Amino acid sequence: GTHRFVQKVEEMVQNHMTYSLQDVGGDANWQLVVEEGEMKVYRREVEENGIVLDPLKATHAVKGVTGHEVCNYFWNVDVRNDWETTIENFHVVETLADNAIIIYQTHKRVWPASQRDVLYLSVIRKIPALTENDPETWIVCNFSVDHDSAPLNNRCVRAKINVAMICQTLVSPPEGNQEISRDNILCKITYVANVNPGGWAPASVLRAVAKREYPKFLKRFTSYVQEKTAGKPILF
């Protein structure tokens, strides 16, 4: 890349690829808090200074869409308001490359506390597969950065995030005279979110909100990708 965040991007993508994909099923520091269909949501309970930082990991498997498609929809700001429900306002502060932008946004008061905002680089990348036996990996990383055109606000508490949507497409081609269809593909999703609320809120409540809001998002977002791609040629 050309832009000034290229090194930080790679580090984030590499850290997600080595640590965020790690298996969490039989990890005793992780608790399965939500299950529904192919969807599972785990959390690790962590606090620093009485502030709840609980890392969150969700895994999902969505029939009929590719990882490329799910990442595309996740990243594309032009469709954000079609699925995202926790945001008051947002805008793009800077475009760094074709695949990388910085975004400022304010969240609805889902917490018993002052309104939060967040300012983050949002980048979409493909990680090539080592062999053709393996899926390519598409990832969108959303992580907090600073920018001059969005200094600390005086009304909102500035949250800090490290988030990734990581997707791999499994294909199961049919045996006969038929071409691959969407009935023959399945997107495996790992979604990780590490959010620093930027100040105190009662923990019991933050965990309630996380338990409620992440699975809601993943269902509506994934369903929306299924809707928008249905009947359309497959983008691997």
Ligand SMILES: CCCCCCCCCCCCC(=O)N[C@@H](CO)C[C@@H](O)c1ccccc1
């Ligand atoms: C900082 C105040 C956020 C309040 C918590 C709301 C739970 C969010 C569930 C859905 C996240 C969808 C989600 O990942 N949204 C992205 C597009 O808006 C930005 C994002 O990567 C982010 C993740 C977590 C918190 C804030 C932004």
